Amino acid sequence: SRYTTEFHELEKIGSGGSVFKCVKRLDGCIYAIKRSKKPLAGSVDEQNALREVYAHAVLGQHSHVVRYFSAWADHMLIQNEYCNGGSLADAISENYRIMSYFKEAELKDLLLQVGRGLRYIHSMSLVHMDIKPSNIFISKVMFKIGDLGHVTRISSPQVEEGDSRFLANEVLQENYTHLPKADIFALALTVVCAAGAEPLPRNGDQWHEIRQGRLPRIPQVLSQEFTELLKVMIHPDPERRPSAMALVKHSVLLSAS
Ligand SMILES: Cn1cc(CCO)c2c3c(c(-c4ccccc4Cl)cc21)C(=O)NC3=O
Numbered sequence: 001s002r003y004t005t006e007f008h009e010l011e012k013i014g015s016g017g018s019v020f021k022c023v024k025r026l027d028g029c030i031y032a033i034k035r036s037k038k039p040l041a042g043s044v045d046e047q048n049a050l051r052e053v054y055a056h057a058v059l060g061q062h063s064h065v066v067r068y069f070s071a072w073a074d075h076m077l078i079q080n081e082y083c084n085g086g087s088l089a090d091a092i093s094e095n096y097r098i099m100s101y102f103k104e105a106e107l108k109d110l111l112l113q114v115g116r117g118l119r120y121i122h123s124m125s126l127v128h129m130d131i132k133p134s135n136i137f138i139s140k141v142m143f144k145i146g147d148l149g150h151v152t153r154i155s156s157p158q159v160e161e162g163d164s165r166f167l168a169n170e171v172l173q174e175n176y177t178h179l180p181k182a183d184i185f186a187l188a189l190t191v192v193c194a195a196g197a198e199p200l201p202r203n204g205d206q207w208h209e210i211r212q213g214r215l216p217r218i219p220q221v222l223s224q225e226f227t228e229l230l231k232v233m234i235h236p237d238p239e240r241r242p243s244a245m246a247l248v249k250h251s252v253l254l255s256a257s
Pocket residue numbers: 013014015019032033034066078079080081082083084085086087137138146147148
């Protein structure tokens with residue numbers, strides 16, 4: 001196999017199939033390589049599997065999207081940029097336990113970086129559809145969007161919904177008029193997680209209350225300007241939320257730019 005002869009496996013970094021940290025023998029370099037069961041040819045699962053690859057391959061010029069090098073094929077493999085700093089989810093678990101979270105200046109920088117990623121994705125007429133901390137990777141720290149498995153075209157009539165902790169009500173209601181603002185809503189909840197919040201609910205009354213536009217408790221004092229920008233980003237009306245372009249140019253974020 002090309003995987004075996006081309007790469008030396010260093011360590012398993014993800015299970016689900018598996019992602020390994022590998023050194024390509026020819027270029028000396030470390031890559032994250034994801035191995036999955038190859039779906040039946042011409043199936044709906046294969047189409048979903050191939051969109052991730054097509055997405056990766058138009059989304060390779062961006063500072064805040066994980067770079068793609070190659071993909072090939074009873075397994076499919078994708079070889080991406082290895083991010084040395086881990087996921088934002090793991091940074092956020094380490095913080096949780098030590099009672100020291102991202103401070104406001106770092107929450108702004110996270111928000112702005114990912115927001116530039118989404119601006120790039122959105123201007124490609126694409127949407128990500130699973131923005132959450134386990135799909136933001138760290139490598140000045142850099143934040144990069146990864147895991148392009150739910151990526152779709154912006155006017156798509158059918159959608160695979162992302163994680164329910166981070167899901168906009170209108171997407172759940174099957175309303176895809178404003179898909180870009182689903183990414184916006186998930187970015188805000190991602191930032192709240194990073195600020196120190198309790199694990200987000202997956203359903204039930206607390207789930208609904210957030211979808212009414214109310215921020216979860218944040219165990220630290222943020223400026224009103226900043227808090228207000230997070231709240232508008234979870235507004236029940238997707239049209240009231242900022243576009244990624246509006247986000248990155250927002251005055252609240254100027255001091256991060
Ligand atoms: C579980 N896991 C951990 C990591 C490294 C964090 O230090 C990781 C990465 C990726 C991916 C990934 C996600 C989705 C599709 C393909 C890949 Cl290679 C998954 C990763 C990826 O594309 N780049 C990564 O670093």
